[PDB]
Scaffold this active site. Sequence first.
Site, short mmCIF file in Angstrom:
data_model
loop_
_atom_site.label_atom_id
_atom_site.label_comp_id
_atom_site.label_asym_id
_atom_site.label_seq_id
_atom_site.Cartn_x
_atom_site.Cartn_y
_atom_site.Cartn_z
N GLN A 125 -8.43 5.38 -7.24
CA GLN A 125 -8.02 4.73 -8.48
C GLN A 125 -9.19 4.73 -9.45
OE1 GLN A 125 -9.40 1.52 -9.31
NE2 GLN A 125 -8.38 1.44 -11.32
N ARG A 180 -6.52 -14.47 -17.06
CA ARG A 180 -6.20 -15.01 -15.75
C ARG A 180 -6.47 -16.52 -15.74
NH1 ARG A 180 -6.83 -10.21 -12.70
NH2 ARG A 180 -6.06 -8.57 -14.11
N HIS A 235 1.34 -4.24 -13.40
CA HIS A 235 0.07 -4.64 -12.79
C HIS A 235 0.23 -5.97 -12.05
CE1 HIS A 235 -4.28 -3.33 -13.02
NE2 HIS A 235 -4.42 -4.49 -12.41
N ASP A 275 5.71 -0.49 -8.39
CA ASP A 275 5.15 -1.61 -7.65
C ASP A 275 5.47 -2.92 -8.31
OD1 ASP A 275 3.22 -2.14 -9.61
OD2 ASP A 275 1.55 -1.32 -8.44
N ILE A 318 7.03 -6.02 -4.06
CA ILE A 318 7.64 -5.45 -2.85
C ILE A 318 7.19 -6.32 -1.66
CG2 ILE A 318 7.77 -3.48 -1.30
CD1 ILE A 318 9.13 -2.96 -4.04
N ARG A 319 8.15 -6.97 -1.00
CA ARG A 319 7.83 -7.95 0.07
C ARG A 319 8.61 -7.71 1.35
NH1 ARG A 319 4.37 -8.00 -3.11
NH2 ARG A 319 3.59 -9.78 -4.33
N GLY A 359 0.60 -4.42 -2.83
CA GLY A 359 -0.72 -4.98 -3.11
C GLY A 359 -0.99 -6.24 -2.34
N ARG A 360 -0.57 -7.38 -2.88
CA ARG A 360 -0.94 -8.68 -2.31
C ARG A 360 -0.67 -8.81 -0.80
NH1 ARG A 360 0.96 -9.72 -7.57
NH2 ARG A 360 -0.46 -10.91 -8.91
C1 LIG Z 1 -6.45 -9.11 -6.42
C2 LIG Z 1 -5.90 -7.87 -7.09
C3 LIG Z 1 -6.75 -6.87 -7.54
C4 LIG Z 1 -6.25 -5.73 -8.14
N1 LIG Z 1 -7.09 -4.74 -8.53
C5 LIG Z 1 -6.60 -3.62 -9.11
C6 LIG Z 1 -7.45 -2.53 -9.57
O1 LIG Z 1 -8.71 -2.63 -9.41
N2 LIG Z 1 -6.88 -1.46 -10.13
C7 LIG Z 1 -5.55 -1.35 -10.32
O2 LIG Z 1 -5.07 -0.33 -10.86
N3 LIG Z 1 -4.71 -2.32 -9.92
C8 LIG Z 1 -5.16 -3.44 -9.35
N4 LIG Z 1 -4.30 -4.42 -8.93
C9 LIG Z 1 -2.86 -4.23 -9.15
C10 LIG Z 1 -2.20 -3.66 -7.92
O3 LIG Z 1 -2.58 -2.31 -7.74
C11 LIG Z 1 -0.68 -3.67 -8.00
O4 LIG Z 1 -0.24 -3.11 -9.25
C12 LIG Z 1 -0.06 -5.03 -7.85
O5 LIG Z 1 -0.85 -5.86 -6.96
C13 LIG Z 1 1.30 -4.75 -7.22
O6 LIG Z 1 1.99 -5.92 -7.07
P1 LIG Z 1 2.05 -6.69 -5.65
O7 LIG Z 1 0.71 -7.35 -5.48
O8 LIG Z 1 3.12 -7.65 -6.09
O9 LIG Z 1 2.45 -5.83 -4.49
C14 LIG Z 1 -4.79 -5.58 -8.31
C15 LIG Z 1 -3.96 -6.59 -7.85
C16 LIG Z 1 -4.45 -7.72 -7.25
C17 LIG Z 1 -3.51 -8.79 -6.77
O1 LIG Z 2 -6.12 -6.97 -11.63
C1 LIG Z 2 -7.36 -6.88 -11.36
O2 LIG Z 2 -7.98 -7.93 -10.99
C2 LIG Z 2 -8.07 -5.55 -11.50
O3 LIG Z 2 -7.11 -4.60 -11.88
C3 LIG Z 2 -9.15 -5.58 -12.55
C4 LIG Z 2 -10.50 -5.69 -12.19
C5 LIG Z 2 -11.49 -5.69 -13.18
C6 LIG Z 2 -11.13 -5.57 -14.52
O4 LIG Z 2 -12.11 -5.60 -15.53
C7 LIG Z 2 -9.80 -5.47 -14.88
C8 LIG Z 2 -8.81 -5.46 -13.90
#
Ligand SMILES: Cc1cc2nc3c(=O)[nH]c(=O)nc-3n(C[C@H](O)[C@H](O)[C@H](O)COP(=O)(O)O)c2cc1C
Ligand SMILES: O=C(O)[C@@H](O)c1ccc(O)cc1
Lengths: 335, 335, 335, 335
Positions: free
Chosen positions: D125, D162, D230, D261, D264-265, D284-285
């Site tokens: 990524q 956030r 996201h 995405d 999805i659970r 993700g989570r």
């Molecule tokens: C703690 C956390 C960190 C994430 N970091 C990134 C990241 O660095 N780059 C990115 O493209 N998406 C990031 N995502 C988004 C995930 O790739 C994804 O789109 C999202 O978590 C999917 O939903 P889900 O958590 O409901 O499965 C992050 C999500 C979470 C919860």
């Molecule tokens: O969702 C996130 O936390 C991740 O995608 C992220 C991390 C650093 C950042 O600056 C932006 C998004």
Amino acid sequence: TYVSLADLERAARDVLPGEIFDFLAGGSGTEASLVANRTALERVFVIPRMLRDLTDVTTEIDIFGRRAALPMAVAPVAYQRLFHPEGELAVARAARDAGVPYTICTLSSVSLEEIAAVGGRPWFQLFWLRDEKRSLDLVRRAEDAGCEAIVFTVDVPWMGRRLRDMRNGFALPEWVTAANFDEFAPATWESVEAVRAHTDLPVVLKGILAVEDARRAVDAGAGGIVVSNHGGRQLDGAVPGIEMLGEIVAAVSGGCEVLVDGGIRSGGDVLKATALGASAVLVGRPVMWALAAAGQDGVRQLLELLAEEVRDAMGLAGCESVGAARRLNTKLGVV
Amino acid sequence: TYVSLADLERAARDVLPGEIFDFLAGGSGTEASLVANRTALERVFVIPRMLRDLTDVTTEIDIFGRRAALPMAVAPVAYQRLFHPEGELAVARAARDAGVPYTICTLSSVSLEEIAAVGGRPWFQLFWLRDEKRSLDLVRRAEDAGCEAIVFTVDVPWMGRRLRDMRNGFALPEWVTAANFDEFAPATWESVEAVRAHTDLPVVLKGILAVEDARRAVDAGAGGIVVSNHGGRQLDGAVPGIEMLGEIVAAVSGGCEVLVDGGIRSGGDVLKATALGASAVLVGRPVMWALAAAGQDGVRQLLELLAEEVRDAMGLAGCESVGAARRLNTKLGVV
Amino acid sequence: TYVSLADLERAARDVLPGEIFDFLAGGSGTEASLVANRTALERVFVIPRMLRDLTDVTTEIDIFGRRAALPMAVAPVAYQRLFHPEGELAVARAARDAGVPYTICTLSSVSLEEIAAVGGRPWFQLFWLRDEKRSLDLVRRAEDAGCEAIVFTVDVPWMGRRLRDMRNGFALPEWVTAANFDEFAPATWESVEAVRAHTDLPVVLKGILAVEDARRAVDAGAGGIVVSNHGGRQLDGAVPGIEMLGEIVAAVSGGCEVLVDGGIRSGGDVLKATALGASAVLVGRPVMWALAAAGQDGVRQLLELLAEEVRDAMGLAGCESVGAARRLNTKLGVV
Amino acid sequence: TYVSLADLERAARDVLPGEIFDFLAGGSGTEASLVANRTALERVFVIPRMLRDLTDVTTEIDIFGRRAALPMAVAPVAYQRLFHPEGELAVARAARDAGVPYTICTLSSVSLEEIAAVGGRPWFQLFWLRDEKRSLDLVRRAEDAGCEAIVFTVDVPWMGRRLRDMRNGFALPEWVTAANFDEFAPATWESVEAVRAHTDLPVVLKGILAVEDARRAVDAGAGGIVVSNHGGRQLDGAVPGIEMLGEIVAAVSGGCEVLVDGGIRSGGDVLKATALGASAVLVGRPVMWALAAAGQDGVRQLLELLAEEVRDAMGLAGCESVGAARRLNTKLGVV
Ligand SMILES: Cc1cc2nc3c(=O)[nH]c(=O)nc-3n(C[C@H](O)[C@H](O)[C@H](O)COP(=O)(O)O)c2cc1C
Ligand SMILES: O=C(O)[C@@H](O)c1ccc(O)cc1
Ligand SMILES: Cc1cc2nc3c(=O)[nH]c(=O)nc-3n(C[C@H](O)[C@H](O)[C@H](O)COP(=O)(O)O)c2cc1C
Ligand SMILES: Cc1cc2nc3c(=O)[nH]c(=O)nc-3n(C[C@H](O)[C@H](O)[C@H](O)COP(=O)(O)O)c2cc1C
Ligand SMILES: Cc1cc2nc3c(=O)[nH]c(=O)nc-3n(C[C@H](O)[C@H](O)[C@H](O)COP(=O)(O)O)c2cc1C
Ligand SMILES: O=C(O)[C@@H](O)c1ccc(O)cc1
Ligand SMILES: O=C(O)[C@@H](O)c1ccc(O)cc1
Ligand SMILES: O=C(O)[C@@H](O)c1ccc(O)cc1
Ligand SMILES: O=C(O)[C@@H](O)c1ccc(O)cc1
Ligand SMILES: O=C(O)[C@@H](O)c1ccc(O)cc1
Ligand SMILES: O=C(O)[C@@H](O)c1ccc(O)cc1
Ligand SMILES: O=C(O)[C@@H](O)c1ccc(O)cc1
């Protein structure tokens, strides 16, 4: 005295062991489909007709060559001795006395021949076995014993994920067995044809939800289908049967009987199903609540209550017959 | 001082015996239709007009040959002595003083002649009796006593299943009787014709929900209909009248007056009903709350409050007359 | 440090007397329209664009001949000394410093000339008075004092039924007065023409909900409209402005500025309004929360937060300008 | 033993520090988009097919030139050492063993080369950096280390608001760092072209919601897109990806892989996504819940559970392959 089916659920929860109540009540996965069966009925409203002749209101139907007292049959529910010591015999006796068809299960806890001997012109539910010959032997046994229809369950290639049962560590007690035996194979359209070729009885496919599967059922020579998500016990996220019913009724265009089940909890719900085009409904869990609460007499009281509610709903809606109820219109509402 | 109709329900629940409050509040079955009457109104939003002349706002209508002060009448409610010792006389006096039609019931707890003697140009609600001649005699009595319309209730071939009443074991007190008598037959279109032939008064069919029943009512010579599910007291699962109203208004195309009832709880609700095309509304339970709370004076206060709310809503919506309110548009929203 | 507008409501409820908080928070009747303003925004989802140039994101707009820092103005709110001793002066100073237009009210608790002297190119909200000459004199005063637009409120022929105020027995404290005076007449289209003929300033009609009233506003020579149900304070059951906005924007087809208000509680909500076609929004209650919580500094912090949220939302949605945000698509969801 | 993904969230909340759980769980703003991701899936119902051959059910797919064991990959989640000391290595090992692609993050807390050395044919990524050369160097590093696709995140011109993190004062612990470095620029279509020109690997644009952005992605030479908001962490009020998926699948018309995405659970949710047209999902989570709860073994158990749920759902729906699942129909329901 029970005045609604909800009185019976309360009574059943009081008496049954927790894990057995959960086996009965539960669905697969998150129970989304279980809840949706209720939601789907609650959103349907009937547009009643007024000022019609109600001097001889009848709730009777003709189905699979027998007169039934209501547009209703007892759904197949495995292992009825889980709920009361008399199990299937208690339910079958009450159904017979009420003039309602009773569906004898492949996984009955009393043998199909014993239950058929109760009388009342019974149906037989088939699960397809890995040993095919065993499946066809059950069909022949059912037919020899006087069963009037084969209800082939088509939505159980295997059992769904029952999280209540998994969490409870649920297993059958030693005193409850599959009495028809001394292991499931997925059924296919070929299996349906093998059954159709092995019996003169109407074959009814239970668990149809897709419109083209309903059409194919008619093409395959089915005498009926049950539009059903198996009470929310199989695919979690399967659409409720009641939501597919109207489209399916239109597509089969009188080519077979179209039943529905899932969440029928009153005569008003029966009326809704009929108004959406169903030939008849199946009722599952409430029959078991009544069995648990008060045995044969409980089931009798449940069926008497349902009969009264169906007659009440039909007449209030201007319907002197089930056919007239099928011509009612409906309207979707909210919550 | 009451500032909303909800103030009156609270007051009525405080004073009335539980079983009498339940007789009043309740519906049939699961009370799905009772709740839906409220939901259906709450989903409707009005699109108000601005900048119109409001120098002579009038809430008056002409209906069945009389001017009424509001587009509203008191619904037929049986046995009003259940709620206050003065019963129907208290309500009729307040309705007269407010310029609102009052519907005298077949099952009034004071005789129809006594209630008519109050004045105020009353209507008479008819239940069809097993003894037909008794039905037609009631009509003639009503007409002789100066009633101005016959409100023939068409949605009670028999009484719905009132589970609150069943559970409470509800029965009339010895001091409340059907004062017009010294048993219901289902009404049909033939009954309607018998009534129409026996009176010069406008016949209003109360309990119409199907569009073709509204059309047939006009063809049958009805002067009006009330689009109604009987306050959710008859078929449980019957669509709310407010949900059928627009379609019915379009179908009858000025051929009769089209009233609606069920869940009207404010002048804003009256405005919604009018905007959907109603000629007028009936109000049931709130009139009885007011009667229970404070007798004739209570009903007076309720009608004064409703009058103020109707005037307020109309003017805020740019409507100097009820006809202008009927030309308002609406939009469905959520919860 | 406030990170959302909800932080400010909590702070305002802590400090304000109950009856003053209720005057601010409340709506008319059952508060159906008040709640619907929020529901309506919560159902709208934005379809953001990606990968667009964001090297010079600007939240600025040109409206009524002035550059504004955000697509937002402070809504007219009567009697701001109810919330803080500095009242309108505190709010006007913060709005000026943030580059946001401030709407001076007919019922301001500090004179319109004093508030205009703060600077920041203010607007003036007009209520039509029974004495017409008084109305037109206010307009001339506003214009002489440097106000840039006349916001003619068209949805208050009289005040709605404020049940919180009635129940609280709410009245202005002796130290809060209508400072522009030493009584409302319903406005009509003739009143609009009288105002348009008496000023060179753009006339903006506030409280339009019907599509044909928006069209007529353009035909009448309005420079703008505010699509609004008056924060749910006027007709209870009036559709939210946000639900009429898209249809109104299409109908006026660039003929005037189209603003919206009611329930804007974040920069994301501003983005939704813009995506539905609004030129700008008004914000009412949150500005008063900030005033109550921390005076001028509170309002400054609120506007800084809103500015950041608007910039954030726009950029995340791929919009380098408010015009690009107006070209975003939306999709309705649930709850 | 975990029987649903919800068992893992409960376990993760027990073990993780509050502020780290909030970093993981939270979304931007009011968390409207976070909640909507779940709502959107819960409203979709599958119309299963019956009686199909299930003798060799396979959950495998081919994507970006590799066979994957499930139509699923581990989503990019920054800073996995926040959740367990083994961080990305634990997750990557479990993903490898399960045959599921793992997405190595630009902000990984273990270097991309170390994580790639685990094996399992990983993806990488990319965040676009203010220093462009750094961005392209990361791409080259990823390719040199054996990553198989570049997942270019296109919905983070900057980080969303956030509010949980702001209120908690959240910052990385000193022992968690961005291990790929010894600051974000907004990406544009020019950035996409620079990446596409710098690698032979498929470029996958993550965070597409608009149909024309999906079309443009195909025109730009993307090998895939991830339809995504996201996880509700970027624009608060962004439509859920699942709500745009069907329209996007139709528009791209096989021109690239279309992943989705957000929320999805379960395997049932995977089935819903597939039925709406997705090639595969990201999760993700839940992967982080499993990591927090029990490290590598936890992630293994999660993936085994998901694999079982996917196989179960597919077979119950009559699908012997993922391609057959893509041909399933769906129906929207309520709550
Ligand atoms: C703690 C956390 C960190 C994430 N970091 C990134 C990241 O660095 N780059 C990115 O493209 N998406 C990031 N995502 C988004 C995930 O790739 C994804 O789109 C999202 O978590 C999917 O939903 P889900 O958590 O409901 O499965 C992050 C999500 C979470 C919860
Ligand atoms: O969702 C996130 O936390 C991740 O995608 C992220 C991390 C650093 C950042 O600056 C932006 C998004
Ligand atoms: C405890 C239980 C056992 C069941 N066993 C069977 C069975 O052996 N065969 C079958 O086709 N359906 C079976 N069903 C499904 C029912 O026939 C029926 O589809 C479902 O119960 C109808 O929904 P209702 O319970 O909401 O009325 C069972 C249902 C329950 C609750
Ligand atoms: C206690 C009670 C008694 C009623 N009695 C009659 C009746 O004798 N005849 C009739 O046509 N309707 C009767 N109704 C129905 C009302 O006329 C009316 O349709 C209904 O109450 C309207 O709904 P509302 O109560 O929500 O205003 C009765 C309703 C109630 C609550
Ligand atoms: C306390 C209060 C006083 C108001 N006074 C006026 C007024 O004098 N003139 C006017 O046109 N609108 C008035 N409004 C309506 C606002 O201009 C605006 O339409 C509404 O507050 C917008 O909704 P919001 O509060 O949800 O942001 C008032 C609103 C409130 C809450
Ligand atoms: O679209 C319909 O009318 C049908 O699918 C349906 C039936 C019941 C229901 O609750 C919702 C939808
Ligand atoms: O729903 C049930 O419990 C019943 O249909 C069933 C019983 C055994 C089985 O293997 C699968 C399904
Ligand atoms: O479809 C309509 O507009 C009408 O049936 C209706 C009226 C009120 C309502 O709440 C819902 C529907
Ligand atoms: O709703 C009622 O209670 C009223 O309409 C009624 C009274 C007696 C009856 O038999 C049927 C209905
Ligand atoms: O129909 C629409 O799209 C529009 O009226 C609308 C806007 C916002 C909303 O919440 C619901 C409907
Ligand atoms: O909403 C308000 O309170 C404001 O618009 C108003 C003030 C005085 C008034 O008479 C009518 C409305
Ligand atoms: O309109 C649709 O079918 C699609 O946008 C959709 C998908 C999932 C959902 O929950 C709602 C809508």
